[PDB]
Amino acid sequence: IRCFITPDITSKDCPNGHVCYTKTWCDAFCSIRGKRVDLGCAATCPTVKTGVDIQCCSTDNCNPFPT
Amino acid sequence: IRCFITPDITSKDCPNGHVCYTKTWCDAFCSIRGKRVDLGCAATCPTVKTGVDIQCCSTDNCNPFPTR
Amino acid sequence: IRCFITPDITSKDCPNGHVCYTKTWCDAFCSIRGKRVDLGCAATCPTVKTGVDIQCCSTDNCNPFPTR
Amino acid sequence: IRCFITPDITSKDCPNGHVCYTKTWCDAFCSIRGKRVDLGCAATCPTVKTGVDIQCCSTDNCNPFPTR
Amino acid sequence: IRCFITPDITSKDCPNGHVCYTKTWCDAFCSIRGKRVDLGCAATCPTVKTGVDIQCCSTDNCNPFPTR
Amino acid sequence: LDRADILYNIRQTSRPDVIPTQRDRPVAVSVSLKFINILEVNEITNEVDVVFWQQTTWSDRTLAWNSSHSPDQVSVPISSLWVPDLAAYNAISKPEVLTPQLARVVSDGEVLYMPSIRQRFSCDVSGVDTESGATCRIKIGSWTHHSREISVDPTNSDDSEYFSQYSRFEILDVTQKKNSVTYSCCPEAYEDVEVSLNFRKKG
Amino acid sequence: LDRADILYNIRQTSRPDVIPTQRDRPVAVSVSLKFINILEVNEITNEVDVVFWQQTTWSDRTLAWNSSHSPDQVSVPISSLWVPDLAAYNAISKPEVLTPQLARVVSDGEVLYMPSIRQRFSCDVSGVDTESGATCRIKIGSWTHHSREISVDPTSDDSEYFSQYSRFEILDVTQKKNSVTYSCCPEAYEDVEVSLNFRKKG
C-alpha cells in the first residue's frame, strides 16, 4: 500500500506494510505552529503512548496533511 | 438589589444581597493611578481591614465609579 | 532683628534673636559649586566646629549672599 | 635540486637536499580554507605522523601549489 | 654653564653646575613615542642605572632635543 | 511580490511604538510561559533562576499582505515591529535574551514573538524537597497599557514532555490563570497573567 | 486624531534634552520610592541590594493635546521625551532597569515614568537583627539641575505590597525632602532623602 511518508511531501511504495498512520501530539513548540505529525506506513497499527493521538487507514494515500 | 459589579462596567442582578459596596485602598501602584477599588454586591456590609476604606448603600446602583 | 534666612532668598522677622549668622564650610560637592552656606538668625553667636567658618553681625540685614 | 619553498611562492636552490616534499594535513581551520601545506626541500623523505599526508619527488620543481 | 632644562624647551642659567646632561631610557610607553628623556644641568656627571643611556657635555647649550 | 519586498513593506510603514489600535478594541495578546529549565534554587532567599520561552502572540492587521501567489510567512526583527510592553511584576533581574530577537509574521497579520529567556524571580520556593513540591508564582502583564488597549489571555499541551530531562529539578504541573483587576481612575482594569509553576527536586 | 498621530506629535516636536521650562518656574517633579524587595544585606560592609519603583512624575505642557473626541492617555518611550536627571547620591551600582523604558503621558501634559529598579546602596545597615531594625538612608536628587530648574517633592500603606517573600520585612518609610543652598547660584540644589526602616524576618 502506497502511503504518505514524512518528512517528505510525497507518496512512497510500501508493498504491504498494511497501514498508513497519522501520529499527532502536542509538545512545547505547539500552541503556535501546532501538534507535531510524523506520517508514514508500517506492518500493523502502532502502540499508543498516553495523550498521543492516532489515525490508521487502508486506502491508497489515505493519511495526508491536514491544517 | 442591582449593584455595579467589578471588574465590569455594568450593573447586575443581586436578588437581595442587601448591599452595594465600595472597597477602596492604597497599595504601591497607587500614587500614580490611584487607590484600588473592587465594587460589588453582598449579603451584609463587609468586615473592615485597618486602613481599608469602605462605602455601603441601598439605592439601585448607588456605588458607581468615581474620579477623585 | 531682620536677618536673611536660608534657603529662602528673603529677609524675615526675628524679634531679637540677637544675631544674623553666616556658616560657611567646604564639603565634597565644594570645589566646583563652592562652600555650603546656611544663613539665618539666632539668640546668640553659635558654637564653632573645627574648620567651619563663621560670620556674626547686628545690622538689619547684614549677612547676605556672596557671589563666590 | 631546486624545490618550491614555503611560505614563499618561489623556487630556491638546494644543492642536493635530495627531495622536494609536500606535507598536507587537515586541522581545525580546514573545512573552509583547506588542509595546511608546508612545502620545501630536504635531505631525505620525512617521517610520517599518523593522518599526515605526504608527497616526495625529484624533478626540478615537482611539488608546486595545488587547490584542495 | 647655560643648559637646556626639562620639561621646558628653553635654556637656563646654571652658574657652574659643571655639566649639561641627557638621560635617555626605554620604558613601556616607548616603542611608539620613544625613549623618555630628562634634560638638565648638574654639579657633576650623574650615576648610571643599568640600561639607562647617558650624554654629558660642556658647550653652552650642548644637550638639546633630538627628533627620533 | 517577494520576501524582500514584504520586509520593505513592514519595516518602512509599520511603527515600533504605535500600538496597533482598532478603535476601542484592544490588541488581542495571547501569552504563555513554556518552562525549559530550572537552574538555581534558594529555599532560604526565595530566589529562582529559570529559563523559559515567553510564547507571545498577537494580531497586527496593518502589516497584512496579499499572499495568494506569494510567501505565506516571513521572519521580521523585533526592532522594526510593535511589541507588547509585557513585564514580570515579580522580576528580580533583567531579561537575558538567548535567541535572535526576531518574530514570525503571517500574511493575515498574525505575529509570533517567542523569545528564549533567562530571568531570576522572587517567588514561593517554600517546599522544594517534598513530594508536593514548591508552588512558584510568577505574575506578568503590561506595565503601561491596560485592558481596553491590550488584553492578555493564557491558553492543551504536556507542559513537561520537553522541559529539560537534565535539570536538577522536575516539573509537576503548570497552570496559567488570568487575573483582571480594576483601578480607581480609568475605564477598566490593568489585565495581567499569573503563571503557577509547581515543581520539585530530583531523586 | 488617533494614537499614532499623537505619538507623531510627541516624538517629532518634543526634545529629549530641552528641560521643559516655563520661564523662572521650575519643572514640578513629584518623586517616590516604592520599595519592592530587599535582596542582599551585609551588616559588615553596610551594603544593601534592593529593588524599587522610582515612581517619578512631572508636567511637560508642550506635549499636551486636544483629547475631547480622542484618547486620554498614551504610552511613550523614554528615549523620545525629556526626563529628570535624577540620581541616587549614595549609589554603589548602576541602574538595572527591569520594565520596558516607557512612560505614560496624559493629554493635559502630565508624565508618568515609574521604572522598576535594582541598585545597590551604601547606607546605615547597623541594626538589622533587632526589633527596632536598621534605618537605611538613600539620598536622591538631580545631579546637574538645581531648584528653580527642577523641584523635587515627595508626595499609602507602604508595605501592603512589598514582597511577602523577602528575607526581610518593612517597618516604616518616610520620604522627607531636604533643601540645601550652595555658595554661588541663585538658590539650592533640591534633593529627596528616603528613610527605609527595615529588619530580618522570623
Place this chain on the structure above:
Amino acid sequence: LDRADILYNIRQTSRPDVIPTQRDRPVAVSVSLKFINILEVNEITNEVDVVFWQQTTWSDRTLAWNSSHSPDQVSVPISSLWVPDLAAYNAISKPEVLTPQLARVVSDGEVLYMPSIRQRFSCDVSGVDTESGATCRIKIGSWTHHSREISVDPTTENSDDSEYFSQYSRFEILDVTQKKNSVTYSCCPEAYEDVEVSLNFRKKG
C-alpha cells in the same frame, strides 16, 4: 574594481534582513561546531561552559562579482550582510563573541562566518570521570526559519578527533559526531531542520 568598491557594492545593495531566496530553493547553510576548550563542568547541575568556533557557511548569490582582474576574497562585517538566525536550543547563556564580527565573502557568492564563542549549556554531563566519558548533546538550528527557507547540514570529514582542541584544558576530547535531525510539524509544508552535535569528552588523567 578595487577592494573598497566591492564593499561599496555589498554594504549598499545587500539587505541584512532579507533571507537570500532563490524561489522555493532554501539557503544552503553548512554548519559545524569545532570545539576549542571545555572550561567549567558541574556533574551535579549538568552545566557545561564551553568555547567553540560555530563554523558557519552559506551561498548568497546576489553579492557575487566579477573577480577576473580583481580580488577573489574580501572581509565584510556581519552587520552589513544577511545571517542565519541559528540558535542553540539547549542554551543557558547568551553568545559571548570573542573575535571580530566579520565574515569572509568570495566572489562566487560564498560566505564564511565562523565566530569564536563562549556559551554555557544544559546537557548530559553524567559520566565525566570515566574512561567512557560523558556524552554531551547540543542541539542547534534556526529559530524562525524552517527547511525550505534554510537547510542546515553538518559536514564530517572525520576531521581529527582533537588535533587543535586546547592541549591545556582540564578535559580532553574523545569523539565528536554531528548528526542532522529533520522533524515535521503539523501545519506548514515541511520540517524545522536542526543539527545535533554530540560531544563525547572526559577529565585529564
Place this chain on the structure above:
Amino acid sequence: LDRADILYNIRQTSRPDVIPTQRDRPVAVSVSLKFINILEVNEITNEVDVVFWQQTTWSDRTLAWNSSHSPDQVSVPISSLWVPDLAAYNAISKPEVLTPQLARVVSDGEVLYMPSIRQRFSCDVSGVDTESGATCRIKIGSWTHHSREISVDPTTNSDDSEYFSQYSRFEILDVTQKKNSVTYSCCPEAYEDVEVSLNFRKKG
C-alpha cells in the same frame, strides 16, 4: 534667548571630537578625584574597589553665549560636547558610571563634568591594618593628548573626608593630588598626568 535655543546652539555647532584649540594654547583642564567610598580591599592582590567623583572641568570658549537677559547655566549631555580623553593608567576595570552622563555649561564657556565612578585599581595596598595606613597611588592622565594640547592641573587645601562615606569599612586619612610632568623623546614637550595619593586605613 531660551534654554532650548541654547542647547540648539551647542548640540548643532559644537563638535564632540574636535579638541577646543586656541592656537598653541592647550585646553586648561582642572581635575580632581573626590573619594566617596572604599568598597573591596585585598591586601594580598593589591586590588582596591573604590568609588569617586572625577571632578573634571575645562574651558571651551566656542560654546559661549550672551547671558545678560538669559539663563547663566544649562545642563548638556556628554554625547554632544568635547570631553577630555582622560584615563587611569593603573586601571584594572572599565568605568562604571552611576550618575547621568551630563555636564554643566556656563555662558562664559566653562564646562563642568563630574561623573560618579566605580573602578578597580592596582595600587599599594600594603599596610591597611595600621595606624599609618596604606598609601594608594592612582595615576591618571590623557591617553592620546600631551601637554600643549591638554594640560591637567589638580587645583586643591580641602578636608576631602567630611563627606567620604561615614558608612564604609574604611576611613580616609589624607589625599594629596600632586601633578607630574614627563618628557618623551620625539615630540615638543611632555605627556602631562596627575598622580593622586590616597592614604587610608581600616576602622575599628
Place this chain on the structure above:
Amino acid sequence: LDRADILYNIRQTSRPDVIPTQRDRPVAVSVSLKFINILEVNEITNEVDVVFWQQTTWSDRTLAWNSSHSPDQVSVPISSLWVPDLAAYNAISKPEVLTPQLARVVSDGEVLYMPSIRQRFSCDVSGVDTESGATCRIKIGSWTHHSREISVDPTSDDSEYFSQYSRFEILDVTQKKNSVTYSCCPEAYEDVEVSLNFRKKGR
C-alpha cells in the same frame, strides 16, 4: 588648516571597513603586547587573567595631510578609522577596554592604536611556583585577513613598568612571529605568538 578641519577630512572621507590597500602590497601592521598586570592565576584550570596594552600600529596613507604650517599629530576615534581585525586565537573572554577608544594619527599616514585590555586566556600555566616559572603562550593574529592583505610583525626590558604591585613578577617576554600556509589561497594567514614567562612573587 586646523585640528577640526583635519578630523573633518578623516571622519568624512575615510572608510572604517575598507582595508587600506596599496595594490598587492599588504597593510604593514606592527604589533606588540606590553604586559601590565597579571591578576588571576589558576594552575589547575590553566586560566590566566591578564591586562596589557595591545600596542598596535599601521600605515594608512589616504588619511595623510600637509602638516607644514599645521598640527603634526591629532587624536581620532576608532569608530571613524579602519582597524586591524586582530584576534587572540587562544582567548577565553571578550576584550574589556579600559582607555578611551581613540587612536593617534600622524600627518604621514601613521596610526597608533594602543588600547589597554583585560582578557582571560587559556595557556600553559603549568609551573607557576618555581624559579623557572610558567611560560604562557598567547597566539594572536587577524581572523579574516591573510598575509598579502595584512602582515603582522612583532618589533626594552619588559619589566620596568609591569606593575610593581602584582601577586606575580615578569621574567622574559619574547614576541616571535609565525607564518603558516593553508591549502587554497595565495600565501599564509600570518599570526604573532607572544611568550610570557612569569612566576608568583616571593611571599
